[PDB]
Structure 1
Amino acid sequence: MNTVPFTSAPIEVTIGIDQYSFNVKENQPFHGIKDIPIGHVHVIHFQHADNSSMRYGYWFDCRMGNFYIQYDPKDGLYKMMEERDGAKFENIVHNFKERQMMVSYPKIDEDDTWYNLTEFVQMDKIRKIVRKDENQFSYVDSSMTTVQENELSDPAHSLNYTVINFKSREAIRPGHEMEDFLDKSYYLNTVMLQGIFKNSSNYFGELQFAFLNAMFFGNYGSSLQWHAMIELICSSATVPKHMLDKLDEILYYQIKTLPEQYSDILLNERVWNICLYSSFQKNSLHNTEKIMENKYPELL
């Protein structure tokens, strides 16, 4: 169990860690979060009491170093930083714990939600989507645009998701125009799985990271990317059976975890109705279909 201390909390802010969140008052004596489960990625994220715009946050993995938070009054936000001095860091953490000024990552032992939502997400892959290689953690926010969004401006701050476009040469073999547009199996399996992602665990990991970025930051281009990756699978006649079964679990926990009041902008009517009811894979998502009908029958 690892710790992320905070130097101070000088401004009122709602702090999130994974699917949990805590309200923190201006200059309240908050000095970090402890008992963070090791073995998964995590995200710590912020929304200032004064500006409900710009949700922002940091992906990290505690095995990659000792990380802490410090408010920067020039740039006006909570920044993640790395402490390289192991002993200076154990010292801060121990002293803060002794004074009991740290909240406890509040995991119910029966709960596999965070695992289920990050099964395939790997910190090394995140850092390739969010390129900033001086840091071992990754900053995302509400307003960052994707590479594909930029093609239709500042590349250093972009989400370098894998570009998927159903009406492109990459997706359509000459001479199989109608075939490949109606049955995307060759874009999925040959182009994307074998060619670019190499295996389905990287595909699934990008899908999961996209969803989480849409949920926690309302990042609109992440939501687009998440829908695109679902639709490519659902629109393929030929999908490995191991992938369909896992997809059904993956989507189930995403729909399960989504705030009820956000289903209107985060859920794309066309994609979901096509995947669950018209696509090749209409019958292969029983768990995702049952939870979608019992929780959001309006959208459908």
Structure 2
Amino acid sequence: MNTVPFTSAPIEVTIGIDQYSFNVKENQPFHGIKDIPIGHVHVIHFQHADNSSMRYGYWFDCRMGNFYIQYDPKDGLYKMMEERDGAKFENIVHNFKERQMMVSYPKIDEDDTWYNLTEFVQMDKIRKIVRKDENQFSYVDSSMTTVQENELSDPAHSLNYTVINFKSREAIRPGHEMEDFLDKSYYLNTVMLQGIFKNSSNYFGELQFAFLNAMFFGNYGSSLQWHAMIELICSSATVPKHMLDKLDEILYYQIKTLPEQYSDILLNERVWNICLYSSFQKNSLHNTEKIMENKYPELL
């Protein structure tokens, strides 16, 4: 298990670590998060108590370095940093653990939620969507726009998700206009899977990362991308059976984790009704359809 120590907590803040969250008071003796499960990416996120518009966080993998958080009073945020001195880092963590100044990552043993939400998410793929090559971890916040949002403004601070546009020459073969518009299989299988993503695992990884960014940071463009990647599959008549079965599992755990009270801001009525009841795959997502109908019947 790995540890993200905090130098201090000078401003009151709600800290998230993956699907968990806890409140830290102004100048409370908080010095980090221990017992973080090795083997998964993680996200540590922040929402300031005195200013809820400050929503930002960091994706990281403890296998890639020793990371800590320190508040910057000039930029007014908690910053992730890497500590290259291993023995210094260990010495800091040990002192904080001995004084019990850390919260423990509160993973129930029965509980596969985080694995189920990040099965296909890799840190290397995150670092290509979020471009800041000098760090091993990736900063995301509420307001970051996507490359596609910027085409319809600072490019360095953007989310480089794969652009999906159903009325684009990439999506529509000349001479196959009706075919490709009513059946997105060409666009899914040849353009996206064979061409850009290379395999379904990378496609699902980006889909999963988009969902998590939208939910944890209230990022609109991430929400748009998640829905577009769902709709591209559901609107394709020809999808490998293993991908349909895996998508059903991916979406089930996403809908299960979504806060009940955020459904008005995280779920697109049009897309979900189209996907579950009108699309080629309307009968292929049995688990997702069942949880959606029992948890968010209003949306449908």
Into which bin does the TM-score normalised by the smaller protein fall? over 0.9
CA distance in 1, matches of 2:52, 2:81: 24
CA distance in 2, matches of 1:23, 1:154: 32
CA distance in 2, matches of 1:296, 1:101: 40
CA distance in 2, matches of 1:295, 1:14: 27
SS of alignment partner, residue 253 of structure 2: helix
Q: What is the 5 A alignment of 1:88-99?
A: 88-99=88-99
CA distance in 2, matches of 1:150, 1:268: 21
Counterpart contact for 1:59–1:137, Cα < 8 Å? yes
* Equivalences, count: 300
SS of alignment partner, residue 52 of structure 2: coil
CA distance in 2, matches of 1:230, 1:224: 10
Q: Deviations over 1:105-128 (max 9, x none)?
A: 000000000000000000000000
Runs ≥4 in structure 1, deviation > 6 angstroms?
none
SS of alignment partner, residue 206 of structure 1: helix
CA distance in 2, matches of 1:191, 1:54: 38
Report the counterpart of residue 266 of structure 1 in structure 2.
266
Residue 180 (structure 2) pairs with residue 180 (structure 1): yes
CA distance in 1, matches of 2:107, 2:248: 24
CA distance in 1, matches of 2:227, 2:123: 22
CA distance in 1, matches of 2:209, 2:55: 16
CA distance in 2, matches of 1:225, 1:22: 28
Q: Deviations over 1:1-59 (max 9, x none)?
A: 00000000000000000000110000000000000000000000000001111311000
TM-score calculated relative to the size of structure 1? 1.00
CA distance in 2, matches of 1:147, 1:119: 25
Q: Deviations over 1:111-160 (max 9, x none)?
A: 00000000000000000000000000000000000000000110000000
CA distance in 2, matches of 1:209, 1:67: 21
Counterpart contact for 1:29–1:101, Cα < 8 Å? yes
CA distance in 1, matches of 2:54, 2:98: 34
SS of alignment partner, residue 55 of structure 1: strand
Counterpart contact for 1:4–1:69, Cα < 8 Å? yes
CA distance in 1, matches of 2:101, 2:249: 37
The offset of 1:265, in angstroms, is 1.5
CA distance in 2, matches of 1:37, 1:205: 19
The offset of 1:289, in angstroms, is 0.2
- Which residues of structure 1 form unaligned runs of 5+? none
Report the counterpart of residue 39 of structure 1 in structure 2.
39
SS of alignment partner, residue 236 of structure 1: coil
Q: What is the 5 A alignment of 1:274-293?
A: 274-293=274-293
Counterpart contact for 1:31–1:101, Cα < 8 Å? yes
CA distance in 2, matches of 1:269, 1:30: 41
- Which residues of structure 2 form unaligned runs of 5+? none
Q: Deviations over 1:58-97 (max 9, x none)?
A: 0000000000000000000000000000000000001110
CA distance in 2, matches of 1:267, 1:95: 44
SS of alignment partner, residue 255 of structure 1: helix
CA distance in 1, matches of 2:55, 2:153: 20
CA distance in 1, matches of 2:168, 2:99: 59
SS of alignment partner, residue 14 of structure 1: strand
CA distance in 1, matches of 2:149, 2:58: 22
Counterpart contact for 1:54–1:143, Cα < 8 Å? no
CA distance in 2, matches of 1:201, 1:241: 14
CA distance in 2, matches of 1:218, 1:3: 26
CA distance in 2, matches of 1:153, 1:97: 43
TM-score calculated relative to the size of structure 2? 1.00
Counterpart contact for 1:71–1:78, Cα < 8 Å? yes
Counterpart contact for 1:69–1:80, Cα < 8 Å? yes
CA distance in 2, matches of 1:188, 1:160: 19
Report the counterpart of residue 209 of structure 2 in structure 1.
209
